[PDB]
Design a protein around this nucleic acid. Sequence first.
RNA 1: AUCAUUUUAAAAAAGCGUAAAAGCUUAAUAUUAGAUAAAUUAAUGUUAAAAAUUAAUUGAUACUUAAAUAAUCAUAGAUGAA
Lengths: 237, 191, 330, 158, 176, 38, 126, 63
Amino acid sequence: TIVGSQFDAQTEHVNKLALDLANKKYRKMALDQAVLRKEKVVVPAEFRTEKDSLISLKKELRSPVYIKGHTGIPDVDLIADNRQVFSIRRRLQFQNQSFYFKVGNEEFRCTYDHIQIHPMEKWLVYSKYRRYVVGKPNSIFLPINILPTFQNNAIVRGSEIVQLLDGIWVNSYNDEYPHSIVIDPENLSKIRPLRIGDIHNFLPDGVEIDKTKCLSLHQKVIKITGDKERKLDIALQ
Amino acid sequence: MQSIHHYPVMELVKMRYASCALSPKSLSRDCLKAIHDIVFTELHNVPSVLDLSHLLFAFRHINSLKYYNLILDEICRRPIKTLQEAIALLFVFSHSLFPNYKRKEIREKDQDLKEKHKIVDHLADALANNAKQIQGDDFVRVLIGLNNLQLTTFKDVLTHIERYIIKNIDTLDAFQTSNALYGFSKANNNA
Amino acid sequence: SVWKNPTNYLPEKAKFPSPKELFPKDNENSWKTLNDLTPSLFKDVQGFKEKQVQRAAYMQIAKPNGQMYHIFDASKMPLGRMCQKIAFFLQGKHRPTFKNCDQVTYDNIIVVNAANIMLTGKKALLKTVKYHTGFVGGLKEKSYKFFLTEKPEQLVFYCISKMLPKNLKRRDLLKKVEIYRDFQHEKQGLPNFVPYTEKETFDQYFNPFVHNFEDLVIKFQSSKETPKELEGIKKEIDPEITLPFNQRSKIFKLNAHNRRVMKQWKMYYRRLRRYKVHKIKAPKNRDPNLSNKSFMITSDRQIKDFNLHNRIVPEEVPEDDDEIMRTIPR
Amino acid sequence: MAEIKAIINLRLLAGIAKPNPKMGQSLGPLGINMMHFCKDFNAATAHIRSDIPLRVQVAAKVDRSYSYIIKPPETSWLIKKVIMKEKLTQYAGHVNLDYIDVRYVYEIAKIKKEIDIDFKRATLESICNCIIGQCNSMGVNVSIIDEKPKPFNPKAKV
Amino acid sequence: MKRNILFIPFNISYSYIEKNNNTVKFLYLYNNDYFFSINFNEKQSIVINEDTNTIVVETRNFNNKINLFNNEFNKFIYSWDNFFFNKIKFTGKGFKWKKKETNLFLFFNRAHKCFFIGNNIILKRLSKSKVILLKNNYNHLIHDSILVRTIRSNNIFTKRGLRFSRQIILKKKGKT
Amino acid sequence: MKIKSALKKYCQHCYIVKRGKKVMIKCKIDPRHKQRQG
Amino acid sequence: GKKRRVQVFTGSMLQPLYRYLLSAKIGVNPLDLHGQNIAKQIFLKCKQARPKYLQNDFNATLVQDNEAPASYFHAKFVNGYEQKWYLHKSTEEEINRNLKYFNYQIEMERNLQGHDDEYEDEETQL
Amino acid sequence: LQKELYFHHRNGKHFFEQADRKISFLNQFTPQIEKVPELAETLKTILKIATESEGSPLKRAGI
RNA sequence: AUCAUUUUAAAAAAGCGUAAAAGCUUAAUAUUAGAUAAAUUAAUGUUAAAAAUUAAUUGAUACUUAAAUAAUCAUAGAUGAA
Ligand SMILES: [Mg+2]
Ligand SMILES: [Zn+2]
């Protein structure tokens, strides 16, 4: 490669730094998929008025904003610049991260729920969010992310993990909540797959499942196949 | 903000250190941009070198490189004729360096060092001529000023300090002992 | 001991043979008809902008009679704007003693320099004049290109007739209008526009012979051979011309600022193609006896009409087989 | 002249190089003498068994000159000898059935290195890793075997 | 930026002049026979080399006409004590010419006469299928050379007919 | 030539030229690719 | 796809630069920094280039001459011409137009002698 | 946070009593309550509330 | 099937080409010259160091997602601009 082979043989020992480094990142990420980073984000903005219509803003390249509130809370609707909105996506953490909005001295927590774009014109129409308050239930989306395990024996060879759900909807009642979920599927098998109640049993005290959204705890996420050769030998014979 | 122009120069610097020296910069941006814009125009009128000492120690958290040079370019013009002044620059220039992460990724080689020796070549006479004239409160700040500056040249002051402690060994304070033991330990670049 | 640029190192530079040395006994005009050189590039390129000249366009004169005179030079304003105010003055719309029921009008009109007419834009070539002549088919269109050269005077007299009120008083008015091609009118006791024949010499910009030698300076020179036609000028040779634009102190540097300016200059040259004068190119002669170019005597009738029995070589004469030369002199 | 008009890959037996008409389709229009050519081939390959098929390249030039160059035999043919099969899998990756052991790979790599001009810069791990990827495409694997095989002479098109 | 280049031949010798005011800049070419000057705006900066007799230009004015300004300036100087040249050929059976004192007689299967007559050119025959023209202006040459071409040009099927000695030729199969 | 309102480039060598209000395509290889817009 | 049938030939208009040379002599000062590398590249184009478009007796060299004022590119043409171009100030583009100022004339000299110094049309198509 | 990786822990030293000396040659920054006579009666009552209160609240501020 | 090596870099190839071969060009890339990389916000008071700084914006250039505005063209009938 970038150095001749004859010199690389002298420096073949050097490449431990290559492999010793990749230990560090990929292990760090693999265990940090779950945790929200502890870093405050802020979004200066302005109130709504009946004067500022859409198309007026959209030559000025501002954007509307919409928030849906929760039990007993009123809705709030705001104005902001487009480039704020895309920068809020451009984090890793966008699916769940808590973003604030400073109008004046006030701050309003939120989450990302979604955005609409005018498809034929392809400019930003609005940026929709969901309120978060500490002492009350709050909808969030906990994605599932499965680690690899070379410790089970069926997972290693000729079998295939099947992630039927990407995430879980829940209700959180406290400040810091987990970004995602991480699973070590060693004890799983063809005989038992994972089911949502196996997760419900293992969560913090501030979290609960939103039964209004899911179907049943007996529903299952991670499924494991049988062996391939045991099919393939039977396929030919 | 209604009476910015009624202030002298240094009575604005006191606001900078009063607010920006701790974690929240309590003031706004515009109120500091005003202070930040006035001062670097009126450097031609700050009388003393201590008045630069207060200044640099307060304005140390600036992200713009362009104005540190204005300060040091000024200090290269105003000669110093005492010894407390030179101490008052090393101890300040130590903590108030311009870090390399704020600097650009592409740059002249080792240009952080060239910012230093403009001072250290401007100081080397005074601190060397009269280092015997030295006392316990002004004593500590040199060992710190040099250790924080990563050099190996300033031995002569230290020899004049070797002779100093042993005489006053008994009359020392609890405070002047640690900084010596901590200073001489890592004198010339952790030797 | 280090890189210092030399001073006196230049070698001889090989001199090539001249056409006299190489092709004697042949037509000198070959190596004397120099390459064409369009002037219109230069005044655009090297930045000559003619000073804005502001001559007279029209004029109003009174007499102790009631009769007023209205005079116009059609080479100075456009055609329409000349023709609007005619219909506004020929009636008496500026005269506050104006009744449109008047059988009499004390307003007279004169026009001069109708050959050269101002028409803003690409209109002298494209626009047309149409009419029909009673018979089927008909519908004859004509170009301004016909009028503006052959008979431009119907045109000025044709556009007036369209702005005037369509009525019976018209003919009495148009009986009191007069047009000329020359720079004069023949009436006496009235003035005449002075024509502008001068043309700006831009000679002070590209010629030392106009300036005095003590104001000038030589910054660079090639040879030790100094012209006698240039004597009395100093020689303060720059160390700076020969430096390319990197080795100088000031470098012009593309940047968000200058590129922003670049785009302003770009629109300027597109915004000026619109303000350009177009001209009717004249008909052409193709007499081979006049041109400096070669030609053909394809047929026989081209001989008699031009009397080209001379330049044709007779048939009673030998020929030339091969004209190679091995040695090239020096 | 010295400029290269064309390059051709071929396959030849060592000492039985002979003006076969099934090679004049390539070297015919280039005006090259098959007889004068094959002479210089068989002369060099007298230290090689005659059953074996090699390959060669020919930088045919603008003046119909030539400069032949010799390379080791086809790497696939060498493994069919050890494997004692003639034809390999349609599919690959999915259908893996054949087996060699490393102790011959270490010996057939030396064949490539001792002769081929391209690998003069190369080490043996390098060469051995080249064929393993060639083995993945074929239905072949590298597994320890104590036993030896018995002789086989898999075909070649010549 | 495009930094256009002005060639100067070797027979020519030049000078560069400015005011004390430095608001005017112009340049002077001078030969045994001729002399010629031209200025430079305040927005055109200049570099010179005696090593190459080449001059380099930047333009803060961003005028695109300069690319034409070059070719005129360059060729107008090489038009002093040097020719331009061109060569013509043909290939065919019933084709020929005859040459008599810059009066070329063409016979290419046409009923009518085909005389070519050169005003202030040079024409010298090197073979039956070849003739060179020479003249100091390039623009009159092509008008002089192409008239010969228009009598017969290359067939797109066979390279039979006349052609310049340097040209893009087209070919198309026919009657395989 | 053939008058295509919607012009189109067939080969890479095709290219556009504008002479006033006139527009067209030309190719240095295939002279059948050339067009006009009318 | 589709087969071309129009064959556009561009062999006769091919005009390379180093074709009328007989020899060359690079000269180098190790004290130049702009006049070294310019001569490095030329020496490649004299040998790395193709020999068809050169003469048969073309031999290019390279020498380190500390005694020179500046690094040079000496050259010799067919019909007698000879020059030198120092390189501490110039570019590779300013050099080529000098070479054209010779190569354009040698044609005007050799064609008059009867020599066809041109290439066949079939050498390079578009 | 990045902060944990570039923070000199302030425990294990009576910092401010130590740290205020090393600057004390800078006179203009030396705080002075009695310089503000109108509020000095108020400001000082606050600091009593700080130290006298439970915990070590002011002492935990920078620490 | 998509492995592997030599290379400063080079696809069991994104395409043209061949009876099959050969041959041509892009991706990836080097030498040389010219040449874009400029402005900022928020943090732990001061002590680690032959040494190392996070989150984030705007803007110049190229690749890329693409849309919008403005002008031009987008054949015309039958007594004569209509
Ligand atoms: Mg490959
Ligand atoms: Zn095409």
